[PDB]
Design an enzyme around this catalytic site. Structure first.
Site, PDB file in Angstrom:
ATOM      1  N   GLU A 120      64.657 114.206 -25.865  1.00  0.00           N
ATOM      2  CA  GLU A 120      63.323 113.646 -25.930  1.00  0.00           C
ATOM      3  C   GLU A 120      63.168 112.942 -27.269  1.00  0.00           C
ATOM      4  O   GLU A 120      63.544 113.490 -28.314  1.00  0.00           O
ATOM      5  CB  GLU A 120      62.282 114.754 -25.817  1.00  0.00           C
ATOM      6  CG  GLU A 120      60.842 114.261 -25.796  1.00  0.00           C
ATOM      7  CD  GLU A 120      59.839 115.383 -25.601  1.00  0.00           C
ATOM      8  OE1 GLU A 120      60.220 116.561 -25.745  1.00  0.00           O
ATOM      9  OE2 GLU A 120      58.671 115.089 -25.279  1.00  0.00           O
ATOM     10  N   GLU A 205      48.823 114.171 -26.311  1.00  0.00           N
ATOM     11  CA  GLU A 205      48.995 115.603 -26.062  1.00  0.00           C
ATOM     12  C   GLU A 205      47.760 116.314 -26.551  1.00  0.00           C
ATOM     13  O   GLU A 205      47.388 116.176 -27.706  1.00  0.00           O
ATOM     14  CB  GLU A 205      50.220 116.169 -26.786  1.00  0.00           C
ATOM     15  CG  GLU A 205      51.538 115.624 -26.266  1.00  0.00           C
ATOM     16  CD  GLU A 205      52.734 116.426 -26.739  1.00  0.00           C
ATOM     17  OE1 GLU A 205      53.139 116.266 -27.900  1.00  0.00           O
ATOM     18  OE2 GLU A 205      53.291 117.213 -25.938  1.00  0.00           O
TER      19      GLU A 205
HETATM   20  O1  LIG Z   1      57.048 121.454 -20.035  1.00  0.00           O
HETATM   21  C1  LIG Z   1      57.039 120.678 -18.856  1.00  0.00           C
HETATM   22  C2  LIG Z   1      56.240 119.401 -19.079  1.00  0.00           C
HETATM   23  O2  LIG Z   1      56.764 118.680 -20.184  1.00  0.00           O
HETATM   24  C3  LIG Z   1      55.999 117.550 -20.555  1.00  0.00           C
HETATM   25  O3  LIG Z   1      56.596 116.879 -21.682  1.00  0.00           O
HETATM   26  C4  LIG Z   1      56.405 117.506 -22.938  1.00  0.00           C
HETATM   27  C5  LIG Z   1      57.730 118.032 -23.451  1.00  0.00           C
HETATM   28  O4  LIG Z   1      58.169 119.042 -22.571  1.00  0.00           O
HETATM   29  C6  LIG Z   1      57.566 118.619 -24.860  1.00  0.00           C
HETATM   30  O5  LIG Z   1      58.825 118.771 -25.493  1.00  0.00           O
HETATM   31  C7  LIG Z   1      56.570 117.883 -25.787  1.00  0.00           C
HETATM   32  O6  LIG Z   1      55.447 118.748 -26.131  1.00  0.00           O
HETATM   33  C8  LIG Z   1      55.605 119.517 -27.321  1.00  0.00           C
HETATM   34  C9  LIG Z   1      54.715 118.973 -28.442  1.00  0.00           C
HETATM   35  O7  LIG Z   1      55.128 117.687 -28.871  1.00  0.00           O
HETATM   36  C10 LIG Z   1      54.723 119.902 -29.654  1.00  0.00           C
HETATM   37  O8  LIG Z   1      53.722 119.510 -30.556  1.00  0.00           O
HETATM   38  C11 LIG Z   1      54.492 121.362 -29.281  1.00  0.00           C
HETATM   39  O9  LIG Z   1      54.732 122.118 -30.481  1.00  0.00           O
HETATM   40  C12 LIG Z   1      54.247 123.443 -30.470  1.00  0.00           C
HETATM   41  C13 LIG Z   1      55.473 124.354 -30.318  1.00  0.00           C
HETATM   42  O10 LIG Z   1      55.860 124.408 -28.960  1.00  0.00           O
HETATM   43  C14 LIG Z   1      55.232 125.772 -30.832  1.00  0.00           C
HETATM   44  O11 LIG Z   1      56.475 126.430 -30.967  1.00  0.00           O
HETATM   45  C15 LIG Z   1      54.522 125.750 -32.181  1.00  0.00           C
HETATM   46  O12 LIG Z   1      54.275 127.065 -32.629  1.00  0.00           O
HETATM   47  O13 LIG Z   1      53.300 125.064 -32.005  1.00  0.00           O
HETATM   48  C16 LIG Z   1      53.490 123.679 -31.789  1.00  0.00           C
HETATM   49  C17 LIG Z   1      52.108 123.016 -31.830  1.00  0.00           C
HETATM   50  O14 LIG Z   1      51.472 123.164 -33.095  1.00  0.00           O
HETATM   51  O15 LIG Z   1      55.367 121.735 -28.237  1.00  0.00           O
HETATM   52  C18 LIG Z   1      55.199 120.966 -27.059  1.00  0.00           C
HETATM   53  C19 LIG Z   1      56.009 121.587 -25.928  1.00  0.00           C
HETATM   54  O16 LIG Z   1      55.710 122.958 -25.817  1.00  0.00           O
HETATM   55  O17 LIG Z   1      56.093 116.643 -25.267  1.00  0.00           O
HETATM   56  C20 LIG Z   1      55.936 116.391 -23.867  1.00  0.00           C
HETATM   57  C21 LIG Z   1      54.509 115.928 -23.535  1.00  0.00           C
HETATM   58  O18 LIG Z   1      53.613 117.008 -23.411  1.00  0.00           O
HETATM   59  C22 LIG Z   1      55.892 116.557 -19.392  1.00  0.00           C
HETATM   60  O19 LIG Z   1      54.968 115.511 -19.686  1.00  0.00           O
HETATM   61  C23 LIG Z   1      55.490 117.225 -18.074  1.00  0.00           C
HETATM   62  O20 LIG Z   1      55.732 116.318 -17.019  1.00  0.00           O
HETATM   63  C24 LIG Z   1      56.255 118.528 -17.832  1.00  0.00           C
HETATM   64  O21 LIG Z   1      55.762 119.250 -16.706  1.00  0.00           O
END
Ligand SMILES: OC[C@H]1O[C@@H](O[C@H]2[C@H](O)[C@@H](O)[C@H](O[C@H]3[C@H](O)[C@@H](O)[C@H](O[C@H]4[C@H](O)[C@@H](O)[C@H](O)O[C@@H]4CO)O[C@@H]3CO)O[C@@H]2CO)[C@H](O)[C@@H](O)[C@@H]1O
Length: 224
Positions: A120, A205
């Site tokens: 990604e 997001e």
């Molecule tokens: O999961 C299925 C779904 O995915 C969607 O696409 C997602 C990507 O999967 C994902 O990698 C990404 O979202 C990230 C985001 O950018 C981060 O800011 C966030 O970070 C979190 C982290 O997970 C935690 O560990 C931490 O403690 O907190 C931070 C936030 O402060 O993590 C998320 C993922 O969990 O971007 C994509 C868009 O949302 C698809 O769009 C969808 O079709 C799928 O079903």
């Protein structure tokens, strides 16, 4: 609005673009909802917006409504010369946990579903409310006339490269996403010759806050 996509995974497509009310994480919310609106398809671009309010699970994304450029499967990143795109947007408030970001998935399997990939690539244009991308800070990078903080890590088995603004937001932006891929190919060993493009999107997001409204004044994307 021309179309109101307020259903879960409400969907529109036309003119080689698509729009999705992509509330993929909404079951982690304790309250709220979100709608995505098609405002126009003027001048080879898409004009759209999304309104939302969410509570609960502040580290969980509830949604990523997006506009996407439709692409044909089986195109290796190394065989794509250019991914030129521009976006103009506003948020009506910034006291929310949310971003604005480009999202690109690639996979060695050209038929990989659109929810993910092997890799990604995200280009964040806003970072509100103290949220973090996947992983950890890697290095700074000069691309598209700006300096980026590159973060890298994993979401499951998927390697995620997120390019963040060091300060503020970027409400009017244009770039060639191939510059970002080329940088990763050179300096991070990104295997562009075996990775196929899966999606090519921009959206927001949404974690918590609102009522909030994202307006995409214009989005255009091409690739050659
Ligand atoms: O999961 C299925 C779904 O995915 C969607 O696409 C997602 C990507 O999967 C994902 O990698 C990404 O979202 C990230 C985001 O950018 C981060 O800011 C966030 O970070 C979190 C982290 O997970 C935690 O560990 C931490 O403690 O907190 C931070 C936030 O402060 O993590 C998320 C993922 O969990 O971007 C994509 C868009 O949302 C698809 O769009 C969808 O079709 C799928 O079903």
């Amino acid at each position: 609005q021309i179309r109101s996509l307020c259903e879960l995974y409400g969907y529109w497509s036309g003119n080689g673009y698509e729009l999705l009310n992509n509330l993929w994480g909404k079951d982690t919310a304790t309250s709220g909802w979100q709608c995505t609106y098609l405002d126009g398809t003027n001048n080879g671009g898409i004009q759209w917006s999304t309104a939302w309010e969410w509570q609960g699970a502040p580290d969980n994304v509830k949604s990523y409504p997006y506009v996407g450029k439709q692409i044909q499967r089986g195109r290796k990143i190394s065989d794509i010369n250019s991914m030129r795109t521009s976006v103009s947007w506003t948020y009506d408030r910034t006291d929310i946990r949310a971003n604005v970001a480009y999202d690109v998935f690639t996979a060695r399997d050209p038929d990989h579903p659109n929810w993910g990939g092997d890799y990604e690539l995200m280009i964040w244009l806003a970072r509100y409310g103290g949220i973090y991308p996947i992983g950890t800070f890697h290095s700074q990078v000069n691309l598209a006339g700006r300096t980026w903080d590159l973060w890298t890590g994993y979401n499951g088995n998927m390697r995620v490269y997120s390019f963040l603004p060091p300060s503020g937001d970027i409400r009017d932006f244009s770039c060639d996403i191939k510059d970002f891929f080329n940088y990763l190919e050179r300096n991070h060993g990104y295997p562009a010759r075996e990775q196929n493009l899966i999606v090519y999107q921009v959206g927001t997001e949404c974690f918590t806050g609102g009522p909030a409204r994202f307006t995409c004044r214009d989005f255009r994307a091409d690739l050659w």
